[PDB]
Design an enzyme around this catalytic site. Sequence first.
Site, PDB file in Angstrom:
ATOM      1  N   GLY C  67      10.081 -91.612 -70.122  1.00 49.13           N
ATOM      2  CA  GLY C  67      11.059 -92.403 -70.839  1.00 49.13           C
ATOM      3  C   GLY C  67      11.153 -92.055 -72.310  1.00 49.13           C
ATOM      4  O   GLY C  67      11.154 -90.880 -72.687  1.00 49.13           O
ATOM      5  N   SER C  96       6.954 -85.843 -68.490  1.00 45.85           N
ATOM      6  CA  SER C  96       6.658 -85.369 -69.842  1.00 45.85           C
ATOM      7  C   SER C  96       5.783 -86.323 -70.646  1.00 45.85           C
ATOM      8  O   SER C  96       4.706 -85.944 -71.121  1.00 45.85           O
ATOM      9  CB  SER C  96       7.968 -85.118 -70.591  1.00 45.85           C
ATOM     10  OG  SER C  96       8.900 -86.157 -70.344  1.00 45.85           O
ATOM     11  N   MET C  97       6.226 -87.571 -70.804  1.00 46.07           N
ATOM     12  CA  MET C  97       5.434 -88.518 -71.576  1.00 46.07           C
ATOM     13  C   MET C  97       4.273 -89.063 -70.758  1.00 46.07           C
ATOM     14  O   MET C  97       3.206 -89.336 -71.317  1.00 46.07           O
ATOM     15  CB  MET C  97       6.318 -89.665 -72.071  1.00 46.07           C
ATOM     16  CG  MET C  97       5.573 -90.796 -72.782  1.00 46.07           C
ATOM     17  SD  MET C  97       4.377 -90.246 -74.017  1.00 46.07           S
ATOM     18  CE  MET C  97       5.457 -89.469 -75.213  1.00 46.07           C
ATOM     19  N   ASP C 170      11.526 -77.265 -67.484  1.00 46.19           N
ATOM     20  CA  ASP C 170      10.723 -78.092 -66.593  1.00 46.19           C
ATOM     21  C   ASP C 170       9.715 -77.230 -65.844  1.00 46.19           C
ATOM     22  O   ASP C 170      10.053 -76.158 -65.333  1.00 46.19           O
ATOM     23  CB  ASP C 170      11.621 -78.838 -65.606  1.00 46.19           C
ATOM     24  CG  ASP C 170      12.620 -79.745 -66.297  1.00 46.19           C
ATOM     25  OD1 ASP C 170      12.719 -79.684 -67.541  1.00 46.19           O
ATOM     26  OD2 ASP C 170      13.304 -80.520 -65.598  1.00 46.19           O
TER      27      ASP C 170
END
Lengths: 340, 8, 192, 192, 192
Positions: C67, C96-97, C170
Amino acid sequence: LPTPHEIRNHLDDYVIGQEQAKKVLAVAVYNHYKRLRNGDTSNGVELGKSNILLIGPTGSGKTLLAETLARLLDVPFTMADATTLTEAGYVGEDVENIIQKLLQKSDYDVQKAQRGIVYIDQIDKISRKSDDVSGEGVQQALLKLIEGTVAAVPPQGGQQEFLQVDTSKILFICGGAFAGLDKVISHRVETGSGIGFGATVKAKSDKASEGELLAQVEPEDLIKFGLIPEFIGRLPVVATLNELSEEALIQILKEPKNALTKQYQALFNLEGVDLEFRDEALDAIAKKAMARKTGARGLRSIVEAALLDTMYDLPSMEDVEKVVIDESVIDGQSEPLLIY
Amino acid sequence: XXXXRXXX
Amino acid sequence: LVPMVIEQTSRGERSFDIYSRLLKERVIFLTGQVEDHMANLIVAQMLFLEAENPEKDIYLYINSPGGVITAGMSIYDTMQFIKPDVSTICMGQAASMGAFLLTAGAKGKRFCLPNSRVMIHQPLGGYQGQATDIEIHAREILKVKGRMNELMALHTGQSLEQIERDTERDRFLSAPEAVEYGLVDSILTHRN
Amino acid sequence: LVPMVIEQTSRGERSFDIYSRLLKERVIFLTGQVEDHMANLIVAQMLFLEAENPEKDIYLYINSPGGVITAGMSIYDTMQFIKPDVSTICMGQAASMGAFLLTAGAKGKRFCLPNSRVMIHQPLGGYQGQATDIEIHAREILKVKGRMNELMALHTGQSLEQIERDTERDRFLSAPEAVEYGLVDSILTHRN
Amino acid sequence: LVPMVIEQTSRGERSFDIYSRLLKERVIFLTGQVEDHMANLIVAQMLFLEAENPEKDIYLYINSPGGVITAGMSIYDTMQFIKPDVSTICMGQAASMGAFLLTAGAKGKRFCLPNSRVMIHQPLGGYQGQATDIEIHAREILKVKGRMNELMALHTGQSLEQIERDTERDRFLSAPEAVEYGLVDSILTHRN
Ligand SMILES: Nc1ncnc2c1ncn2[C@@H]1O[C@H](COP(=O)(O)OP(=O)(O)O)[C@@H](O)[C@H]1O
């Protein structure tokens, strides 16, 4: 007159698997009676009493340590239960009954009942409920009792009089089992776990002994359990039984002179018949004992139920000099072998 | 003789 | 709906929600997208456990598709500030996060499930306005990308040059590959 | 609305919701689509039962049309990690992911209702963007399809080649066929 | 809103919702469309009553316009599995799936109100995609239609050929006609 080493051996003869508990009760009872012989003739006056508080699993021989001690010590002993106890005037009970129980051993004691011992069972049942005549209230009444006082007691029930008996001299041993206490101490000392992934699960229910954790028990943990710190302060001595072991159960029937295996052996000696108990039969009893979560207390039911047929038919049978018991017989699928 | 024992 | 459970204690019986029961054992759940409200809730949980006991390890289970970045960095700085070692576990997915908070856990107390999956890419953004304002927001997101790669290398042990090439697009990493990459320490295949 | 029930205990009377009462008996309900929130809730339930008793079998009733794959794989890895045997039962329907959690139960403790129905197909997905990004997401979903077929063969006992042919398109399996297919062990027609 | 009632007991006074009070007396309510959430809730109620008493009759009041088939079949298998006799009553209306659960009750303990109405038709469905996929979903819904007619004949006593002709299109059955049709046993006009 006795010493801690001498009483340790006598206790060892009837109790096993509890080494730390022997040294605790030995030095405690030793110094306790030393105070009675010397009294207060020395410079020191009003020698304080040291109480004992036992915590261990059920059927771990807590009562046996107090019963065997009374036989060698020869002093009167009583076995009181705190479940019935109620808070000062209710339907269930009053604390006054406990005082007469000790006198009931000899029914006449002026300078003899002060040196007696008392045992209490199921002390955890009166834990302070935090949501009372069952909880905290009961503990408040026992404070003054343990600290030492005098209660009027009709000797033998009857005179128009009552006898005064001191209780400071009288030692108290509050026995009991504290179930669930492992979770309280585990998060405090060893680790907060049991529910998480990385956290250690309670896999070692029977593989490892919870006892080791109980050794690191402190009075602060007992406060969260429900007891009052003021009540625990009066009982500075602490005894912690670790567990019961399967191999110990085999030793319990062989090492103690009063083992049940030896009673039947002596029963047939006068009859002129030999008795035997193989090692392959005792290990099976250990599994059935742990299966019923009763310990050594649920042992006679397994033995007497197995030997009911053999004992009933032994007088009728003739020219039988030996009896052999097998593991299959304990299960009930086989009949014990008979040798002529 | 007769015991009147009651608890609230 | 949340099921209610009963925690048997000596004092008496108490009713707890399933999420609150695990919180008592120093366990926090990170579910769904990372936002300002969901991120601020986990921070209060960590602080509450710090005051109760600063020497017991905390466990953080993460199952999130990622997010907002600023919402996630508040949790990362909190984990490093407090003394307890925040153990991290990846359940289902780690974007990612979610991947940055996973590797940011205490060294030696990071795990990934045998079938879990991690994904890492570069920060996403956008702006609409004058050219002067686009240059400002572009320089800012570039600093974050550089800052996020520097910290990723610090915990993963890889070089900063390697993280820059691997995060350009990605990149999915299986559970075994994450161990070889320094992202995690081991795999919790079975309970021993 | 959830009805409330009374559990008569020695200590006193307590009021419980219908879902919480069954949780006390090591019973978990999997209803609706499988998502990150619903999946993360069941995981907390399994761990809670593990701590209460690690030697008692757990029962998982599944009635779901399927959903996200990553949300479902978190449950599968959890069932295999914990020591207790997670018994699975199919009520109403079991889609692609619902079938994977069904067969993932402990061998010998898997059941299907006489009128239940199981459906299996290949993973679904999609992407919009540059050709380079489409190739990345295509390779990832291909690995999952291969991984999901490998695990399906392990519990069902069939060969990997058979699962590949049977999972190319939607395939419905009646309750008797599921037993013959190795997906389940028996059928709970009546209570004996 | 749900009204609250007081159940006077020897232990003390207790507050219950109107739906929970009837649950104590082995009474379950089936309201609205039959879906996966509403169906999974009733199953937990039946199991709870089985444990409390396996020898007492259960009463099921149905007022529903029907719904999903798979959600309804989970209830039907449960009623047949458990030992207690599940008495069924039709209030207001009983559609295709509501009628199947109505007739599935225990023989001799099925009732219909004097002004109730039952409606039966064939299963509804649809699909969009390749021709190969349409053939698969068509064969599946055909099996359900055949299976639903077989069970309808078993409880109603009629022949399979008769059910096929009567279920080709919508067919409404008044309360008197349902008795003659074997769907129910009697009518509860007045309380004697
Ligand atoms: N070491 C032992 N040797 C012989 N019998 C034992 C031993 N330990 C326990 N027992 C048995 O346990 C019983 C007493 O249990 P007890 O100590 O009263 O349980 P609790 O610890 O719950 O009070 C006795 O009948 C005794 O035969």
